């Protein structure tokens, strides 16, 4: 799996000037065991259509 | 019947009985005595110097008693054998004592606490090894020597007409072992020449506090005017017990103690749960669980909904875990001993807990759950040995799909991420390159300084340890490259380990730890520390943010035990709570980097995420990262300690060769042999063949951590964090496994321990056992070990941090040592200290513990703490004058003051203690004094102490000595990065603006700043402080031939301070009858002089007044990090009164900036003085401590309700001068309600009559306006209340 590039959220024009997005929470986040397995569960759903 | 003359009588007869002969009097407020001390003419000798008489001087004193000295009559301290008139009471104590000797036979030198091992005759080099152990671990400490709480102790059961038994084992271990030791007075932890056992100081001081505490259960017992104590429905002897413990407890006293204080303590918790009826005490508050806004109603009895749960499997596990602890215990102080005896009346009372009731309204039952917490309190401090040994690696669980560790470690990162933005949302971030050089000294209060720093001073060499003193010294070196890459993992470089006791357990271990590693960990932990001290947050189980959670902080915030805990007696007044508690078992061992550590470490990493723009000298955040915290760093390192050392015979060490005799580096004990390797150690170690003791000193036995550390800088954080994950897990499990039983109502964290209010939907025996089976069987999979024995589960009783509550009510537990104390300290203010331990007396009897005992110990304190002390000067024609002369002839005398004891009843300002005889919560003051001789019912009480004011000496107080006379050597090297731009810029110069720079700030000024902040950081030294403490004597000399026995009273103030003696200007006068009805309140355990107070006055039910001009003044210098511990608004407000008020916002900008105050609390400062100038009086109110004390915090008092209701005065006063009555008021108030007076209003007066109007209008003009310092200050009058007070009164 690959994860999107980090600079699509965040543009860095200054030393202390940066852009904030509007989902850094969640951009924030780690899956843990369960997520990860739901997330391989909805994938497994999308290859295999009906 | 007047307490006044019954304890000087009583310090009278113990002052005759410790110095025989005495020439004491009543009526005068001062004695003096001389001693002989031959040790320093000895000394003398042996330079060939010539005396007169040497031991005629002692046999001629010591026998006929009658030489005297200038007058002055010279006495000798009593010997030993007569200080119980040589009675004897054969009692089986003191067998039971002697049969617990051991010989040195059967030494077990790893001992956790020494065994009675016996003393002999001659000597023998394992013998020196036990002095040394027992040199260290037996000190008592303390502020009064033993033999005078034996004197005492004597006395006071004559007076009662009754026998302790510690009296009685005294008395017989007396009779015939004449003196147990040695013990000086200028420095009690001198004791030396044990004569008998090793173990004599732990029985002398056991036995006075056993004594102390059968005088305080019976003198408490005879206040409520009960026959016995009551459990149930059957009676019970509280002394009975007492013996009983004692009697078991004497074989070996620190262990057994340890080993049983938990079955008393789960006692109390368990008592009265399961009784059909239940007594509760109406408690309403707000909707949350922990909201501290209660109020109480009334007593009711209700029936019990979880009578039939009580059969359940769990509880009866919990009580068989006890019933062994307690029998393998006894089994184990038998064997010990030659007796076979036991505990009876404890395990009868055992065996029905749960059925028997609780009684709260009934003093019988509260009497006793009382006593049975404070019995614990006669093994003070326990002093113990630590081993150390490594992180055992072997032994650590690994993930495997059968635990839940790496969801803990999943959660925990989880949780740091959200705990750092909820931080940064509150405008706490981490620290920024630019104040990388001035937060260092932001370290925690938990933190210690690894490298120790060398001074030299002016011609010494000493040594420091202290933040101050090393960082700026050497704090350049702190972050340089070369001592950044370096680990603490061989011989070179290493860290040792330290130690300090704790009041009834196991000495605790502390880490220390270099500055090179603090200071990254600091860099990113700074803001979270910062974050997490506020309070009152939400603790729902369903509320996002979870700052509220964690009560690490949340403590003592309100001052008062009883206000702050309010919620423990709200949840068990109600039914429908069910709380839990969880005691786990080594903590902070179980904290390993599969679970804990690794997971920390992640989210700190991308933590930082947003800030990887910054670089701080090259380096990069995540290289700062693994700088604070990495292998070698913390995790991984060796450590240093107590050596290790092997039992073997002493001609195996003939035998070894020279390869094993070579002696290393480490240091070894008195009485042990080195040897070169702990392998060898293994190979001639010998159990059976006892001769001799080998210690290992090549290194190789260091310990080895990857564990946690007590000495990080975010240890509290990490463990609350840590334990919220654990929570969470419990939760989800329980709600998993058995869903809808059990609704989590609130959750609770703070340090290791876990509380929780639930909801429980069922009383089936089945599923409560499955609950409580699938609790631990999560807490055990998660890694943990929590104990079935300690862990508790109660619908009714409730407890929190050494706090315990029972249906609604208080149960206080005393531990409040008396006798012994934790380390030595020397007293540099005596009446600073005698304040100290009269506000710790407050605490004590406001937790159940007798009044009229707590007076007679502070009569006791109050006359011997500063005999003894003084030095090198005597007195001749009552006058006082150095040390005779160059002739040698008496120098060997000494002079030893004793004070009248009612020099406790004396406010401060008369070279006195403000305590008052009514009640010890009211603060003796002039005015105060003043109104207690004109009111007619004191009179009985106020007579002696009426001829024994304008007699006190000055007191000693080496504080106020402040002299330039400590010059150092060492220079402040890092000040061009201490040094704020403002400092910095008035060094550049050609002396040119030195010339100017004369404004009236004293030592803070530039080209001298630096001086004076090491000056300070030397006096912050003691070791260093001790230079300056030779020349106080003659200072001390100049007060006493200084001093003139004259009152003073002046109620007058100086004109920028206002004091509570201005309420004296007015007539006072009392009206109205108000209501009658008694209040209810939750402590139900106090003495009748603090109940009737507590009854008349109920429970405060809202915040305090508002916080007072300096309140905000010092509130507003919280916020300067390097000032913070430097500055107080005493040192505000005396650079103001030379500097003036009158000046706009700048200048008192520019003027804080020069003092070292960073600009933005110099522009916060000078702007809110500038306001207060403008608008306000300004005017400081001083207090005497009042309203401060442990009881005045959870009194209706101080408060706007009660000036509301109580009060009444002109409208013409101002704002700190309506504080200044209402300080008296609530004084004056307590006062009668203390003397039970009549309830009613009160109100100031003002009359008709011209001239009475006139003296009011000078005196408030010339108190309102400094007289000439108007010139001096320019201050201008057209300020609003000076020109307002024109035609105040007119």
Known sequence: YIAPNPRISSITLTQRITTTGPFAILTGSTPTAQQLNDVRKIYLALMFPG | ?1290
Not at chain 2, 213 to 225: P, Q
């Open chain 2, 1 to 1290: 019947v007047a307490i006044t003359v019954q304890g000087a009588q009583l310090i009278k007869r113990v002052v005759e009985r410790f110095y025989p002969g005495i020439a004491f009097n009543i009526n005068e407020g001062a004695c003096y005595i001389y001693k002989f001390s031959d040790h320093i003419r000895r000394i003398r000798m042996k330079h060939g110097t010539k005396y007169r008489r040497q031991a005629e001087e002692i046999i001629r004193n010591i026998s006929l008693r009658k030489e005297r000295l200038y007058g002055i009559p010279v006495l000798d301290e009593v010997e030993w054998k007569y200080v119980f008139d040589g009675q004897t009471f054969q009692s089986y104590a003191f067998e039971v004592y002697v049969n617990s000797i051991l010989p040195w036979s059967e030494l077990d030198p790893e001992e956790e606490f020494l065994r009675n091992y016996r003393v002999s005759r001659e000597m023998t080099e394992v013998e020196k090894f036990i002095e040394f152990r027992a040199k260290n671990e037996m000190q008592i400490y303390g502020d009064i020597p033993i033999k005078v709480w034996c004197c005492f102790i004597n006395e006071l059961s004559a007076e009662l007409k009754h026998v302790p038994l510690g009296m009685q084992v005294m008395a017989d271990f007396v009779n015939r072992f004449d003196s147990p030791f040695h013990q000086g007075n200028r420095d009690l932890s001198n004791l030396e020449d044990f004569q008998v056992a090793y173990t004599t100081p732990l029985l002398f001081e056991m036995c006075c506090m056993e004594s102390i505490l059968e005088f305080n259960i019976k003198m408490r017992m005879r206040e409520e005017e009960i026959s016995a104590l009551e459990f149930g429905d059957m009676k019970v002897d509280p002394v009975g017990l007492l013996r009983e413990f004692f009697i078991l407890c004497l074989p070996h006293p620190k262990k057994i103690n340890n080993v049983l204080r938990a079955p008393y303590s789960w006692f109390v918790k368990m008592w009265g749960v399961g009784a059909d009826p239940i007594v509760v005490l109406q408690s309403t508050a707000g909707d949350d669980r922990n909201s501290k806004d209660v109020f109480y109603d009334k007593f009711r009895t209700e029936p019990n909904r979880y009578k039939a749960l009580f059969r359940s499997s769990f509880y009866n596990e919990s009580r068989r875990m006890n019933e062994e602890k307690i029998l393998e215990a006894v089994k184990y102080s038998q064997k010990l001993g030659s007796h076979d005896r036991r505990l009876p009346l404890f395990e009868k009372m055992l065996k029905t807990v749960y059925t028997t009731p609780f009684y709260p309204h009934k003093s019988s039952n509260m009497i006793l759950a009382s006593f049975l917490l404070s019995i614990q309190t006669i093994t003070g401090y326990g002093r113990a040995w630590v081993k150390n040994v490594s992180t055992e690696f072997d032994k650590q669980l690994k993930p495997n799909p059968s635990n839940l560790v790496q969801d803990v470690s999943d959660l925990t990162r989880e949780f740091f991420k959200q705990a750092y933005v909820e931080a940064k949302e509150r405008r706490e971030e981490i620290v920024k390159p630019e104040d990388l050089y001035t937060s260092m000294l932001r370290l925690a209060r938990n933190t210690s300084s690894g490298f120790s720093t060398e001074i030299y001073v002016k011609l010494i060499k000493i040594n420091s340890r202290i933040k101050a003193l090393v960082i700026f010294t050497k704090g350049h070196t702190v972050f340089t490259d070369e001592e950044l890459h370096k680990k603490y993992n061989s011989v070179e470089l290493y860290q040792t380990k330290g130690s300090r006791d704790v009041p009834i357990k196991a000495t605790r271990t502390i880490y220390s730890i270099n500055l090179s590693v603090l200071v990254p960990q600091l860099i990113v932990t700074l803001p979270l520390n910062e974050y997490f001290s506020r309070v009152g947050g939400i603790t729902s189980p369903d509320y996002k943010k979870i700052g509220g959670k964690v009560i690490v902080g949340d403590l003592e915030a309100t001052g008062s035990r009883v206000m702050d805990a309010a919620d423990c007696f709200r949840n068990s007044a109600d039914r429908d709570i069910f709380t839990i508690a969880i005691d786990y078992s080594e903590y902070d061992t179980h904290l390993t980097r599969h679970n804990f550590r690794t997971g920390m470490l992640q989210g700190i990493r991308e933590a930082m995420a947003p800030y990887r723009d910054l670089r701080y000298e090259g380096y990069t955040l995540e290289q700062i990262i693994d700088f604070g915290y990495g292998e070698g760093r913390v995790a991984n390192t060796l450590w240093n300690g107590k050596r290790r050392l092997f039992k073997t015979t002493f001609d195996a060490y003939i035998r070894l060769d020279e390869s094993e005799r070579d002696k290393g580096s480490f240091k070894v004990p008195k009485g042990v042999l080195p040897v070169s390797s702990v392998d060898v150690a293994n190979r001639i170690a010998v159990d059976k063949g006892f001769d001799t003791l080998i210690a290992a000193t090549d290194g190789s036995d260091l310990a080895l951590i990857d564990t946690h550390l007590s000495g990080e800088n975010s240890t509290l954080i990490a463990n609350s964090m840590h334990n919220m994950a654990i929570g969470t897990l419990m939760q989800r499990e329980v709600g998993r496994e058995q869903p809808g039983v059990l609704t989590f109502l609130s959750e609770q964290y703070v340090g290791d321990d876990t509380l929780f209010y639930t909801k429980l939907h069922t009383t089936d025996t089945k599923v409560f056992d499955k609950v409580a089976a699938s609790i631990f069987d999560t807490v055990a999979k998660c890694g943990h070990e929590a104990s079935p024995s300690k862990t508790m589960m109660t619908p009714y009783s409730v407890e929190k941090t050494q706090t315990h509550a029972k249906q609604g009510c208080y149960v206080p537990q005393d531990r409040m040592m008396i006798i012994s104390s934790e380390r030595r300290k020397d007293i540099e203010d005596v009446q600073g200290y005698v304040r100290s331990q009269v506000q710790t007396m407050i605490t004590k009897v406001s937790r159940g513990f007798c009044h009229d005992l707590a007076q007679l110990i502070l009569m006791l304190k109050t006359t011997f703490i500063g005999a003894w002390k003084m030095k090198r000067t005597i007195k001749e024609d009552a006058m006082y004058r150095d040390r005779k002369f160059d002739s040698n002839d008496e120098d060997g005398f000494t002079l030893i003051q004793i004070r009248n004891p009612l020099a406790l009843y004396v406010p401060i300002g008369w070279n006195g203690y403000g305590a008052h005889p009514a009640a010890l919560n009211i603060v003796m003051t002039e005015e105060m004094y003043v109104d207690s001789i004109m009111i007619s019912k004191l009179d009985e009480i106020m007579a002696p102490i009426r001829r024994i004011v304008h007699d006190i000496p000055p007191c000693w107080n080496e504080t106020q000595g402040d002299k330039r006379g400590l010059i150092s050597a060492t220079k402040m090297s890092f000040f061009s990065k201490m040094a704020r731009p403002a400092v910095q810029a008035a060094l550049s110069d050609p002396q040119i603006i030195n010339l100017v720079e004369e404004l009236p700030l004293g030592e803070f000024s530039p080209g001298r700043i630096s001086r004076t902040m090491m000056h300070s950081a030397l006096l912050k030294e003691s070791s260093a402080r001790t230079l300056l403490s030779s020349g106080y004597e003659l200072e001390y000399q100049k007060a006493l031939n200084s001093w003139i026995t004259q009152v003073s009273m002046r109620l007058g103030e100086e004109s920028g301070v206002i004091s509570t003696s201005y309420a004296k200007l007015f007539d006072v006068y009392f009206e109205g009858e108000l209501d009658g009805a008694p209040h209810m309140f939750p402590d139900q355990n106090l003495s009748p002089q603090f109940y009737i107070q507590k009854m008349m006055i109920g429970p405060r039910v809202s915040s305090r007044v508002r916080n007072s001009y300096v309140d905000r003044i010092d509130v507003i210098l919280r916020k300067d990090v390097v000032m913070r511990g430097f500055i107080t608004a005493n040192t505000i407000l005396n650079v103001i009164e030379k500097l003036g008020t009158n000046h706009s916002v700048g200048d008192l900008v520019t003027v804080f900036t020069l003092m070292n105050i960073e600009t933005r609390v110099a522009e916060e400062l000078a702007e809110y003085m500038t306001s207060e100038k403008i608008r306000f009086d300004a005017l400081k109110l001083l207090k005497k401590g009042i309203a401060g004390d442990e009881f005045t915090m959870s009194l209706n008092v101080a408060t706007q309700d009660f000036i509301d209701t109580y009060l009444a005065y002109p409208y013409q006063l101002t704002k700190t001068e309506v504080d200044a009555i209402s300080l008296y008021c609530t004084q004056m108030i307590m006062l009668r309600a203390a003397l039970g007076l009549p309830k009613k209003k009160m109100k100031i007066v003002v009359t008709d009559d011209a001239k009475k109007r006139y003296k009011i209008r000078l005196q408030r003009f010339r108190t309102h306006v400094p007289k000439i310092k108007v010139l001096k200050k320019l201050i201008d009058p057209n300020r609003m209340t000076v020109r307002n007070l024109e035609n105040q009164f007119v």
